[PDB]
Design a protein around this ligand. Structure first.
Ligand SMILES: Nc1nc2c(ncn2[C@@H]2O[C@@H]3COP(=O)(O)O[C@H]3[C@H]2O)c(=O)[nH]1
Ligand SMILES: Nc1nc2c(ncn2[C@@H]2O[C@@H]3COP(=O)(O)O[C@H]3[C@H]2O)c(=O)[nH]1
Ligand SMILES: Nc1nc2c(ncn2[C@@H]2O[C@@H]3COP(=O)(O)O[C@H]3[C@H]2O)c(=O)[nH]1
Ligand SMILES: Nc1nc2c(ncn2[C@@H]2O[C@@H]3COP(=O)(O)O[C@H]3[C@H]2O)c(=O)[nH]1
Lengths: 434, 450, 450, 450
């Protein structure tokens, strides 16, 4: 792999995850080694070995992997090796990597505090794991609570540093030295940043200043992180909450006007099946946020083969079908709901996507002459009339929950006049139907 | 057979399976942790567990018999239902929940009911019933708030059981943090055990503290983790409850924000106090008669057929009185009620004046309209609800005296609610209904000779 | 009748009846729980209860005398008003509120004032007063904050009363959690009683804790329930107050968000620093004159007529200065005020460049514009107020050379805030008034021959 | 020179007057309550107060030299500025802040800076500077967080001063709740005194408790009231923090919500994996290149001339290379750049196809094209950035082989971000300019004979 695109090529995402693991080790473990006496001479060699492993990961990132990231210049993807290195050296990422890999030989673990400056890799990995993972709302929750746990971690390290500065057991406020240092300092950090209270009161001036600043930082930063996490879990269920809000507003509207339950159950069932068969209520709300080319792309895959396999659009021009689907809107029809009324006028042509409709005709109606499954067109005949001359020949009743497409009056004719041969072909195929 | 999921009997069985699952999610962990609760009421808990398992087996039978939608239709073939149920993860979860683990009462004794934690795997029935209840209830937000409050109750109860179990493992009375010794007569009572555990879990999850501090590293770990649970999980649920209460007030808050914006605009422009009082009176009328809700935004996601079905029931009394609709054929009403826009007019409002261009016709849903002279001091005749006016200057009257101009001054006395029907919306129905156009032209030419 | 609820004489009554309802919701429970409060000021409490009952009876008379709206018209038939009032649930709640329960003073003693707890059933009158005050005051956010703060105070006071009752039902000084012994001369004072009960209620409801832990099972259960009340009911009101103060300046927040979005767009685009400074100066001008909020979006929820009257009232002095109308009839301003749209232009900006597609009449309200030359050094005519410019291109008069294009270049000397009139909106509106076309054509030809 | 309000020197003086106002709003009450702060640093405090008074006088002089806007023009008349300033409420506040109340130091004592609290009445300068800094600075989110933080600092400082004043009124060391005896060497230190007062104020306002309980009824009442004030203030903190989190995420979370919604739509409808990868890659290309910001939505609150200037300055490099734009007349771009939509295309996505009706004309901004033919394995010539194509089908040349139909194929070699001109949008502006039609007709003829 002499050239890797940052977006795809999940192996690069795994390597960037390894870099994130090294960066998280640096962010989480230097405040421990600076404050807690866990960097004993008995286990200094293991600490330095893992620090060297993280530095090796940083060096392989800055040399091997970031210089192989292909970039776009002039609107074109650049693959040549020397141009990638020049673009990387010109980029801010090289400045952050070089500042993060400052050589500190001089042991003080705070010398490795520049290693926390390689947070650009963490942001890139967050973007990739939110772009390549389906339903990535849970990872945002994990990331925000990791921020909260890291803030509590830093507060625990600061509390242990303050205790060691004050004497480590000199007063009731400081850490008394009995038990595990990290979990009890984390207990202080939890009851401080969450502002629970329930702690020994600070006695000396330094301890009161520290407790003041720690409660202040708790009140602001804790609120920041919980606001971020509530916004994340609210955006996780944003579509569901919006659908429930629209459904409740509709139900309140029908409850206000004393609408009978036979219609209220129909409306509730239509909302339920629309949410279960489309997933986001009105599709056009997401369609309008996309470019026209992406509208064509997201139409040409899911509902193009079903509309090109119909018995009426065969032998037509293939570009009309491209122009067909910019104006096709899906709608859910309830079971035993009259899609077509024989006595009424016809505005729309219907193309079945997922459902079964039954055409009723004969003596006094109520006789299924033909049943139309998915991939069929009904209601096309009444469109080709002037001033609503033609009525529906036979009423059509949807047998079940039928999802189907719509073309209004003077909407198919807007794109039908562009194709004269397709116009006369549709006229002929309408003549054979009658 | 085949039970329809949309049917009422499926909802009834959803409730009847939710009750034993809710019993299992509360009482199994309580019996597992509070040993005195299991020991004292062993006959009652055995009866309730056997009843819950019987209801689980009837839910086995129902899940094999409930229908599933396939290409819109509800299929009722038995083998298809069996295969569809067995292919799902629901069957695996249910059959793992209904393994006969009650035979392990002999191996571990009668004081070990934590082998019924498999019975919690029917939680999907609880969530399905709670989703179905919220759709079909008249008060969805109140039920949602009650559901999240009950989730809080379940989490607090589970934390109480976990705290009691940790105090049991460490030893009662050994530490100042754990639950005190059972040998104390006050703390030896089962009610005291559960209620003090609930108290500890309530204060810890709600991050109040004011509990004896941990004196052991495992206690510190559990207290830190459960404070974190109370922050991440519990406080999120409380924020959801607050958001749901705000969503109860959402329409009222939006309407009051509109009022506040209009008042702030009118306060800056130094508008006269009479017009400010008039606007305030108009908004007080809008809230008092509960006309704040609008038909367009609420029913914007509905199809035209279902909006037509709704709009007929809303305007049933008006559309029988109108001479255009529901008197001869009742055909164009289902197509034309979507084109009607409801408008409400203040008392004394001139809707259309003589010599003005006519871009719409009006159908009086409610109120009393009056035709007046140029000055408007007197009224010629009064128009009650259900009637219509303003149609002379809309359609092409042959031999019109003026043409496309209002032939009468319309004064609105009182607060009149009336529909609006514009030019092209009316022509797109009259072109398809020439017979309905002729009946309007007849009365138009009959009334224009004066 | 008739009280006319939309009028000010009914809203002024709403305050007079809300005060007894607040007194009953605040002081009846306090006298019920703090028996020293009932016993010490018994004469004053009897006087206030009698006055509150008299105001309740007058409220009954008013609700029999208040007018509803049938067919959008104010009802004046007294029997109709009485029948409408009696059919509602409000009459049932009000007659349940005025049940003579004070006769039980001779059966349950003078120290039992919780029998008149039915007077709380007139809460709907208080809520109606709060609803009406919200839409009438000039400070809606401040009043809403005060209303919800008073809800907080009432909830805390009620929980203080409940805590004192529970300490009374268990025993004063019996345990460490309950209120201390009455015989203590420091804790036996009524002020100390109520104020310490309020302190305990504030500690519990705000989830501060800092209270002696419960001793009995009932105390633990009550403390669990009360902390849940403070987490759920209390903190929801607290959070929506916080959001309301956060959403106090909603228009200012939206305008600032617009500024941040535009600046964040222009930051990555690497636009010139002078351009950024000009944009910041433009937005500073928008905020300083408070032209940030648009008139269209705020007033689009209003009906067209009322918005028409508002737009005439705000711009009455400006539209009197024009030469098209407001000379003999002054009726042209009402029809075309909706079609015109407000605009504001930076100094030095060429509002009408030489040889450009003319689309607007550009009626001036505020700002001194000058008719500059082609080279731009010299300016011919200064247009200050009520002076249209652009009456050449909208209407295609005969004998006009380059009628579609502009005949002169116009430069805004200062910040000119002026109304633009659309192309087809004016042309449709021009045909109704015969004077406007004549003056426009004559002025256009006269300044075109120059 | 006179001073313009939008100029940089007015902002500099706003900072230079905010510094003594921020000094007077925090240190006056600190010296009033903490007597050791007023007594010890008298030499420093007298100089600081004199400097603040001098800067107040210079600010009052500047207020008479600040030019407001009459008819959008800066009033440079000194007498008019003085007359308008004196008639405002700000003159009354400025005079009240400069009442010689410092002359009462002789008749009340040198340790009584309670008298000079009237200097706080120039809060308007501080609020205006903070309202103008947020409008001007490049980090509105960081400045808003810092401004909220310093407001909370000021409030907590004021509550600390109030608590110390209440402790000194009740008595030092008389109760466990008050500040202890200042005769003690530990509690007598001024730094320790103010830090403990601030610690109590943060404990009490941020709803933490962890304070000694009140003893007297006045202490209990003050603690309840300050709990309530601090609960409302902490709610305001939480709401404002959530507001700035949503505003910071408004650029991010909107795009992420669009990504999540389109991914749910693609996974739910079971799209091809190649097409899903293409869509996600294109959106990631937008995010990495910051091209997902909507040009039309963000740039719609500016005037048409100013928005034209922004769009021209953004697209300055592209429009010079375009042969239709800024080459012959350089007059049509100022009205045609507004009627333009920027689009970004993936590599090899067939922007234009043979045998298709094209309603748009495309101009390349920063892309490279291929104009392939037939199958597409071969290319004719690459299209450089700054060229235009797709003008054949939209223009109705009489001598056209195909009417309203595209010729050949167009393929994007890489990520091409190109403008588009709609058919009916361009034809409206094409007919007005005589030079534009002839050269496009000649280019179309040259293409057809190619
Ligand atoms: N009457 C009838 N209609 C059919 C049949 N097959 C399909 N249809 C459709 O039923 C539709 C009813 O409305 P239209 O008359 O518009 O168009 C009709 C056809 O599209 C058939 O076999 N008989
Ligand atoms: N001219 C006239 N109009 C009437 C009369 N009664 C009701 N109207 C209605 O008042 C309406 C005013 O506007 P239009 O002229 O459009 O249409 C008019 C009629 O619909 C009447 O007696 N004479
Ligand atoms: N040419 C010219 N235009 C004037 C004069 N006074 C006002 N104007 C207005 O300036 C406008 C410039 O644009 P238009 O040509 O559309 O219309 C012009 C007139 O409406 C004048 O004295 N000469
Ligand atoms: N057909 C064709 N089009 C070309 C050629 N070179 C450039 N083009 C442009 O490619 C465009 C594709 O869309 P159009 O057919 O509308 O217009 C075409 C021309 O503007 C060429 O050699 N042949």
């Amino acid at each position: 792999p002499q050239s890797i695109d940052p977006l795809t090529n999940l192996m690069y995402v795994l390597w960037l995850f390894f870099v994130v693991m090294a960066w998280n080790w640096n962010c989480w473990l230097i405040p421990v080694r600076w404050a807690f006496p866990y960097q004993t001479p008995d286990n200094i060699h293991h600490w330095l070995l893992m620090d060297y492993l993280c530095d090796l990961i940083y060096f392989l990132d800055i040399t091997v992997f970031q210089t192989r990231l292909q970039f776009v210049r002039g609107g074109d993807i650049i693959t040549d090796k020397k141009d990638m290195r020049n673009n990387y050296l010109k980029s801010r990422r090289f400045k952050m990597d070089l500042l993060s890999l400052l050589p500190l030989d001089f042991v003080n673990p705070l010398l490795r505090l520049p290693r926390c400056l390689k947070y650009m890799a963490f942001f890139e990995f967050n973007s990739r794991l939110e772009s390549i993972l389906s339903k990535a709302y849970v990872y945002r929750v994990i990331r925000t609570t990791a921020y909260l746990l890291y803030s509590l971690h830093l507060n625990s390290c600061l509390y242990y540093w303050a205790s060691a500065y004050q004497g480590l057991g000199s007063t009731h406020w400081v850490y008394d030295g009995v038990g595990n240092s990290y979990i009890r300092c984390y207990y202080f950090a939890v009851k401080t940043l969450i502002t629970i209270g329930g702690l020994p009161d600070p006695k000396t001036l330094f301890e009161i200043v520290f407790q003041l600043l720690n409660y202040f930082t708790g009140v602001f930063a804790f609120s920041v992180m919980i606001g971020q996490m509530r916004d994340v879990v609210g955006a996780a269920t944003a579509g569901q909450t919006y659908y429930r809000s629209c459904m409740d507003s509709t139900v309140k509207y029908m409850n206000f006007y004393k609408i009978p339950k036979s219609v209220q159950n129909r409306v509730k069932t239509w909302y339920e099946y629309t949410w279960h068969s489309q997933g986001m209520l009105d599709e056009s709300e997401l369609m309008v946020q996309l470019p026209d080319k992406m509208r064509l792309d997201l139409a040409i895959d899911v509902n193009y083969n079903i509309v090109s396999k119909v018995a009426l659009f065969q032998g037509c021009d293939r570009q009309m079908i491209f122009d067909m689907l910019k104006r096709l809107r899906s709608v859910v029809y309830l079971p035993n709901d009259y899609v077509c009324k024989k006595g009424e006028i016809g505005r729309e042509m219907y193309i079945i996507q997922a459902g079964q409709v039954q055409v009723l005709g004969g003596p006094d109606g109520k006789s299924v002459l033909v049943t139309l499954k998915a991939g069929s067109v009904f209601g096309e005949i009444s469109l080709l009339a002037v001033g609503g001359g033609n009525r529906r020949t036979a009423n059509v009743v949807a047998h079940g929950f039928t999802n189907l497409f719509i073309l209004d009056k003077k909407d198919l004719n807007e794109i039908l006049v562009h194709y004269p041969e397709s116009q006369k072909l549709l006229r002929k195929k309408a003549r054979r139907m009658l | 057979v085949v039970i329809d999921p949309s049917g009422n009997t499926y909802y009834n069985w959803l409730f009847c399976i939710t009750l034993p699952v809710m019993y299992n999610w509360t009482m199994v962990i309580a019996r597992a942790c509070f040993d005195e609760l299991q020991s004292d009421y062993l006959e009652y808990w055995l009866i309730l567990d056997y009843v819950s398992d019987i209801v689980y087996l009837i839910d086995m039978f129902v899940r094999t018999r409930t229908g599933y939608l396939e290409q819109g239709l509800l299929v009722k073939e038995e083998l298809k239902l069996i295969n569809k149920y067995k292919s799902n993860l629901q069957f695996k979860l249910d059959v793992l929940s209904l393994i006969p683990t009650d035979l392990l009462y002999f191996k571990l004794g009668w004081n070990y009911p934590e082998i019924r934690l498999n019975r919690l795997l029917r939680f999907s029935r609880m969530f399905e019933f709670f989703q179905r209840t919220e759709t079909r209830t008249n008060y969805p937000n109140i039920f949602r708030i009650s559901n999240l409050v009950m989730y809080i109750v379940i989490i607090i109860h589970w934390n109480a059981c976990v705290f009691y179990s940790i105090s049991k493992a460490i030893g009662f009375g050994n530490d100042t943090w754990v639950y005190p010794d059972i040998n104390d007569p006050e703390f030896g009572r089962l009610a005291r055990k559960y209620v003090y555990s609930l108290y500890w879990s309530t204060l810890t999850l709600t991050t109040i503290g004011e509990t004896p501090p941990p004196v052991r590293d495992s206690e510190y770990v559990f207290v830190v983790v459960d404070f974190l649970i109370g922050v991440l999980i519990f406080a999120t649920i409380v924020g959801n409850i607050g958001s749901m209460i705000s969503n109860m007030n959402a329409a009222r808050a939006e309407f009051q924000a509109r009022i506040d914006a209009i008042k702030q605009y009118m306060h800056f422009r130094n508008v006269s106090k009479d017009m400010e009082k008039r606007v305030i009176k108009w908004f007080d009328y809008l809230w008092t008669n509960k006309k704040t809700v609008d038909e367009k935004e609420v029913l914007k996601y509905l199809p035209d057929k279902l909006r037509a079905e709704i709009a007929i029931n809303v305007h049933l009394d008006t559309l029988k009185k109108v001479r255009i609709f529901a008197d001869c054929e009742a055909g164009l009403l289902v197509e034309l009620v979507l084109k009607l826009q409801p408008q409400v007019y203040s008392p004394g409002d001139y809707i259309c004046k003589k010599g003005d261009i006519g871009r719409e016709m009006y159908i009086i849903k409610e109120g009393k309209l009056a035709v007046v002279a140029d000055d408007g001091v007197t009224q010629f005749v009064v128009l009650s609800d259900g009637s219509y006016f303003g149609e002379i200057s809309i359609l092409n009257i042959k031999g019109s005296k003026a043409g496309n101009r209002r032939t009468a001054n319309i004064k609105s006395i009182g607060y009149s609610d009336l529909f609006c029907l514009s030019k092209d919306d009316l022509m797109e129905a009259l072109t398809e209904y020439p017979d309905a156009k002729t009946m309007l032209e007849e009365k138009g030419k009959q009334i224009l000779m004066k």
